[PDB]
Amino acid sequence: AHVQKKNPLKNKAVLSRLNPYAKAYKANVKINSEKTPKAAGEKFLSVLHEN
C-alpha cells in the first residue's frame, strides 16, 4: 500500500480522494461592485499626511 506518493496539488485524482469537497469549491467569488464606499475619514487622512 502506497508504493508511490502522489501530490494532491498536481494529481487531481488523489485530491478528490483526500478532499471530498474540491468538487464544489468556487474560489473566485465576486463580492465587490461599482458602489465601493471608500472609507478613509479626514481625521485619518490628516494624521497620515502629517509632517
Binding site: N19, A39, G41, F44
Partner: protein, 50 residues
C-alpha cells in the same frame, strides 16, 4: 468530511472578511485596530548540526 470541509472554509472566509471590515471601520471612523497576536508559528532550521 464534505460538510466539515465546507464549514471550515466558510469559517476562514468569514474570519478574513471580519478582519478587513473591522479594520475598514476603524480606519474610517478614526481609532486604530489591533488584530490578535499570532498563535501559530512555522519554524525552519537554517543552521547545520556543526
Amino acid at each position: 468530511i464534505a460538510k466539515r470541509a465546507e464549514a471550515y472554509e466558510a469559517e476562514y472566509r468569514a474570519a478574513e472578511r471580519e478582519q478587513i471590515e473591522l479594520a475598514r471601520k476603524a480606519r474610517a471612523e478614526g481609532n486604530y485596530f489591533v488584530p490578535h497576536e499570532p498563535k501559530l508559528i512555522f519554524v525552519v532550521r537554517i543552521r547545520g548540526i556543526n
